[PDB]
């Protein structure tokens, strides 16, 4: 009932820290692989394993170790993080030629950002902006905008909730964050989203709208010697009620 699972979904590392990416496979598949994908080159095999007790090198094995002591688990290990290990890592599996088919099943990915200095981490500020009354009167529709600003790394999930239930219809979120400072390497990020409903739905004052941003940050007792609050993994949200206008 699980399939391919990867833990953690997101991670920041300071350069030089080690980490282990877990990969677990429910379906008793013999063959497991690890890939990285970078915003330029598609998927590149790192290591693979045809069976428990057996691992082999992909085309970019360097800087990574792998182990396969059991059939279920294929953890990927980064001995000493370097910035160029910033990427999305996918674990994939397939029955493995005793089970026939060539279809590869992919985990949901683990986003990894390697930075020089953990003082670079900042949770998002999150705000909701209520619909224009001009839009309402010319279009009979009503767009709310959500703005999440000043976060680093760009490890967020933004969701819209109406009357307590997550919606997807009437929504778009920028696929890419804007860098607040484009020429800067550990620049903070801004994201926007819109939710559009009918004017009539927005004009009901018992309707509740919430933009929610789950940020992934510092966690399992990293040290924090600073003035501001530890930028931990947290949800930051903003909300508004309908307005009879």
């Amino acid at each position: 009932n699980a399939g391919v699972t990867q833990t953690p979904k997101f991670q920041v590392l300071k350069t030089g820290q080690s980490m282990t990416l877990q990969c677990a496979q429910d379906m008793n598949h013999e063959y497991m692989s690890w890939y990285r994908q970078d915003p330029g080159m598609g998927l590149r095999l790192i290591h693979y394993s045809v069976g428990a007790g057996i691992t082999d090198q992909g085309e970019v094995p360097n800087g990574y170790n792998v182990s396969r002591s059991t059939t279920e688990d294929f953890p990927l290990r980064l001995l000493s993080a370097a910035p160029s290990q910033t990427s999305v890592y996918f674990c994939a599996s397939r029955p493995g030629l005793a089970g026939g088919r060539p279809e590869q099943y992919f985990g949901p990915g683990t986003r990894l950002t390697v930075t020089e200095d953990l003082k670079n981490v900042f949770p998002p500020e999150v705000a909701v902006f209520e619909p224009s009354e001009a839009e309402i009167s010319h279009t009979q529709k009503a767009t709310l905008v959500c703005l999440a600003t000043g976060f680093y790394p760009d490890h967020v999930e933004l969701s819209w909730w109406v009357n307590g239930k997550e919606v997807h219809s009437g929504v778009c979120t920028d696929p890419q964050p804007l860098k607040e400072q484009p020429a800067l390497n550990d620049s903070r990020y801004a994201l926007s989203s819109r939710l559009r409903v009918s004017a009539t739905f927005w004009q009901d004052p018992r309707n509740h709208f919430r933009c929610q941003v789950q940020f992934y940050g510092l966690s399992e007792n990293d040290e924090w010697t600073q003035d501001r609050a530890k930028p931990v993994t947290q949800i930051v949200s903003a909300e508004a009620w309908g307005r009879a206008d």
Partner: protein, 194 residues
């Protein structure tokens, strides 16, 4: 070894055919695949092909040409929900080692039936006059320009789909922290309106 795809992003009008191809260097290759990956999601196998000619699955057609060493994917009657990245993969082992191409982003732009391009000022729900501007309801031929100011922020266009009304709209968002900033200025740079 070479698996090589078309470079993107590729913009395709709703209703037309989106097409990708992929060339492969190793003449022995036995198996060819197209994976679809939505933004922030995982690659999902959508077509498998093994023999010369065409294979068909709903709106997807794969064609393999072994003599010329390419595989294609055609997405017939394209839908904006098809906007994703599509990845060629070719098998390189007598075990099934997969080599992937670099992927091509496909953008299927909606057919806006009743264009009503307008710019609206939105207010903060609580936060004491904070300012956001929304450009919305323009046609899909419309370009949105980054009005290159230091602290004026402008997103790419994005497409929302209200299923309950069969209505899609393009929009783009701009904002700035109170630097001589009003919605009139924000967008104008987007080349020549009406």
């Amino acid at each position: 070894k070479e698996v090589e795809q078309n470079s993107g992003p590729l913009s395709v009008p709703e209703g037309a055919i989106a097409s990708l191809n992929c060339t492969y260097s190793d003449r022995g290759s036995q198996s060819f695949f197209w994976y679809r990956q939505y933004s922030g999601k995982s690659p999902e196998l959508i077509m498998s092909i093994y023999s010369n000619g065409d294979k068909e699955d709903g709106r997807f057609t794969a064609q393999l040409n072994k003599a010329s060493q390419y595989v294609s994917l055609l997405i017939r009657d394209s839908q904006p929900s098809d906007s994703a990245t599509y990845l060629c993969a070719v098998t390189t082992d007598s075990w099934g080692k997969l080599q992937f191409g670099a992927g091509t982003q496909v953008v299927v732009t909606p057919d806006i039936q009743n264009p009503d391009p307008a710019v609206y000022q939105l207010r903060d729900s609580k936060s004491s006059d904070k300012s956001v501007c929304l450009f919305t309801d323009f046609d899909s031929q419309t370009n949105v320009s980054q009005s290159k100011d230091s602290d004026v922020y402008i997103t790419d266009k994005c497409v929302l789909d209200m299923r309950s009304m069969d209505f899609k709209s393009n929009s783009a968002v701009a904002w700035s922290n109170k630097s001589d900033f009003a919605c009139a200025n924000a967008f104008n740079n987007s080349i020549i309106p009406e």
